[PDB]
Amino acid sequence: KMSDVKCTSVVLLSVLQQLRVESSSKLWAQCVQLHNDILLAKDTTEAFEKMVSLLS
Amino acid sequence: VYRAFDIYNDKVAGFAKFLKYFVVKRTFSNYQHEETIYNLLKDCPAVAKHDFFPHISRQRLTKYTMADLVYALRHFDEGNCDTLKEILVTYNCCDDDYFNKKDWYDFVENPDILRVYANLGERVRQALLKTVQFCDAMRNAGIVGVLTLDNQDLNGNWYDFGDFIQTTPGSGVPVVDSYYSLLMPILTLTRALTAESHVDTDLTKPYIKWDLLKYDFTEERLKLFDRYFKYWDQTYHPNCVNCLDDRCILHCANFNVLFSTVFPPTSFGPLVRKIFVDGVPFVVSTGYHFRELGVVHNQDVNLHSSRLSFKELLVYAADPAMHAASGNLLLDKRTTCFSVAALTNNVAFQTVKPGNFNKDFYDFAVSKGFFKEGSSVELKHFFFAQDGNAAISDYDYYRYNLPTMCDIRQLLFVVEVVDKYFDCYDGGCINANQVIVNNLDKSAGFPFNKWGKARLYYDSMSYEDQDALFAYTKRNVIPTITQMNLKYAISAKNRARTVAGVSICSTMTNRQFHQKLLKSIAATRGATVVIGTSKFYGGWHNMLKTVYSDVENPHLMGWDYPKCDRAMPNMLRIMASLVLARKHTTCCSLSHRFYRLANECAQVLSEMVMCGGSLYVKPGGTSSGDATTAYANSVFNICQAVTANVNALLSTDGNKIADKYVRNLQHRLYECLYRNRDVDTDFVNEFYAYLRKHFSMMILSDDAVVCFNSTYASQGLVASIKNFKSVLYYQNNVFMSEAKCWTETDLTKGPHEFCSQHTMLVKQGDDYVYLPYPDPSRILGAGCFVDDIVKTDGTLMIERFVSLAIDAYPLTKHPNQEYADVFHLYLQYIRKLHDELNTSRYWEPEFYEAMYTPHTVLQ
Amino acid sequence: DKRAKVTSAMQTMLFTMLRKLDNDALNNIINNARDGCVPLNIIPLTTAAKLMVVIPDYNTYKNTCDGTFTYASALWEIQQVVDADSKIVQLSEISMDNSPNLAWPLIVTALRA
Amino acid sequence: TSAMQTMLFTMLRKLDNDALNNIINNARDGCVPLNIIPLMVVI
Ligand SMILES: Cc1cc2c(C(C)C)c(O)c(O)c(C=O)c2c(O)c1-c1c(C)cc2c(C(C)C)c(O)c(O)c(C=O)c2c1O
């Protein structure tokens, strides 16, 4: 069900950007790296790992 | 024993891979004459040794001659790429094992290929200077001849004598246009004469520490010519201000562009004297050293401008003088592009955010059967979000823009074949109120955008003022400052978007200069270019109808140019602008025309770019955010096409061909562009027609579709798929993978893709009509991903849904049902939306029916 | 009415950038040449003393701008230094050890010596 | 975005938060680190 995982990752990145976390650089760089790699998902479990690692 | 060649006899006049150190021959009078000429001309240090023993042999010849080099560059095939590889390896750029980098050939992936290529510029400049030696040896031995390329190995020492006729000494002129023109635009890829930036002009030495003031290089550039192009039988004007009207500028900017390298980048760009406006020593720009144009001294000059009004304030503020000079010097090690300074004393960054997702749409999809485990319609497109280093990482890409020449005796056909392709149009230097303002609230340039958009200025400058500015442009020059921001919109890839809002002034002049031609292309139908056409009402249908007016077997096919708005080469971007102006020769002085061309080639091909705060120099490309950009690269598209057709004709042995009309079309088109100089209206008209026959083109804003006889291309006559790429490579500095270009072989179905659309064949009214439909996933993604603010009033979102449904209505008729349910859900969606509040009722299938059947007449 | 405001802002920005530069070393260069035609890609290279360098990572902070330095055939003693997050940095941190802990683009604010 | 938790319910209905479960596991072995380990560990 990659559809729900992509949508959830998008709304999570949205609330993250809303949280005003743009202070640091490498944190947001890796964050958007995960986001760009979960919006392009071929497997649902890979998206699962990226999503759970990004949630924290 | 197959190589490249150049031939123009009475009948076969071609440039193709024709089939034919101590190369032995197999004639008596001819090799006798060869021996005699070799005995007359041998004491020049540019001639390969010969041997009269009927064998007229050579010696010390690179296995691949200069010809094959120029060819292999001109016709590159990632499939068949033996020659370019072998050359780049044998001559110390990298070893054969360098041929494993995925995308090694590319210019975006593996930009090391730039260095790999420049590893031969010395081998080039050597043969160049040898060639000039040979030209002088000929003129001072008194022989009339011709200068091809299959007769000079990669070292440079020419050979292959026995074709000319003994004249009397001191009186001899050779035909050179073939040589320097074919060989023209590679002296830039390898960056040939770069060695001449050193003290003895040698790498094993420091750079010439040029005075930090030397600007003109006029004498130096003429040294460059009298040393390299002393035999270009046309009055090269160091500054093309002295070239007569138009065909001479294309001939001469094509030389400043080459000599622009040997000189420091600290020397080009504007020229700032110091004007003492009521004493104040304003260091404003009163000149410009363009890389491709020359030392344009602004004729009009005004000291002691005691008072000031709108015109001169704008004229000067547009300059980079008062920013570059009077600004805290800025360095930036991120990029490779040259930098200048910074307005404010702190570098800046901008990060992009992700677009909002529409939940209700997703619910509708999951409930009505979409978004299921294996639906044929999945999601691929979203509103991405970018990180910190975005604007600058956006800017960096320009490193693909190598400055290149373009073969000038070949390009001395196409400017005018395109003149024909626009002949049926209007065109003139119209006045101010003759310019209907389109796209008002678009943008403005660095100083300007801080104060508004183009609308406030078009509200400011009264008519007479813009005409004063136009006259200025006819006799002055002004450079400008773009501002490359980032754009936020849905897509599938993970790169970033780039909007480039050029100055207000470049607009408020180019409009006055082109609006008539614009409108005249925005109101034709059945034309070749199709910008501004209607969108519905058999629109696509009648369009296709035109496209196959009288074609043989329609194997219709389209394409795309890799990164067009950045890798846009140099001489072609000028040709396009010059063709865009021959609609003035009843109103503008050829001087006005040159200075107008200069204003453009300053405000577009290279100017100032505020990249956050880091003012770099745009080394080329094309301003995406420019009005004339669309029709401009449409001209460029036709140019690329027309060229492809030229290279096709010449890339095909007429001997083996049995047809006879196009044969003596090709031979005389050779005679047209490479052997003579004057425009020959007969042949440009005939060839333009012949193109309108067998290669009907549909050209939208930088977007292309073509319909072409397939039989001709089986034997090779018109633009195939591979030739149009082999040319794109060596003239555009990008690479178009054949996998990214398609070919529909049965007109029963539409084009696989044009304007991002596929087309089907239905029976509306029991009629075989052609309807184009979008990608369903694209419409889906566009659905549940909202770009702008819509939560306040969904009006714009409602209209977005409407437009989606109008694109989707050609799915209702699509075979696959799920596709139709896409439209169905969109419909019911809009139904609920309007409920919350027939032909005005867009929540009825008949509205969407009206706007596609190919006979309706309404709004 | 706003047309007057924006046309005014043009030359206002002009004259104030002039004042922000206005000097005589500029005048010292203008007389060293002809009627004045001189490339604009050299003026701030000479008549400016507020060089700003954006250093991306470590491996260039070693082959390039360091802790005074010379560039543009001049001398530059490094003044206050700031990282990509607009925060102050001390020079001892720039080494292979603590490098992965700083906002990378290191903007310097050197002066001419 | 309050619906984030709403979609995270259905997410957890088929995920069991594999990495969060691994972290709670590492916490269950009595090896609770000084800080959360990037997705130190003492004893
Ligand atoms: C005008 C503008 C100026 C910007 C500037 C100035 C001050 C120079 C920045 O300095 C800058 O950094 C920007 C970047 O964020 C920046 C920018 O994004 C825009 C912009 C925006 C936001 C929306 C637009 C829309 C929306 C309603 C969707 C259009 O429909 C549209 O047509 C546009 C074009 O005309 C259009 C547009 O140009």
Ligand SMILES: Cc1cc2c(C(C)C)c(O)c(O)c(C=O)c2c(O)c1-c1c(C)cc2c(C(C)C)c(O)c(O)c(C=O)c2c1O
């Ligand atoms: C909705 C619409 C319907 C049209 C229809 C209907 C009745 C099917 C035609 O039949 C028709 O012929 C049209 C002409 O092309 C036509 C049309 O142009 C638009 C439209 C356009 C082109 C641009 C818009 C832009 C741009 C400047 C990007 C906005 O920024 C914006 O906000 C808009 C919303 O209000 C907005 C807009 O509505």
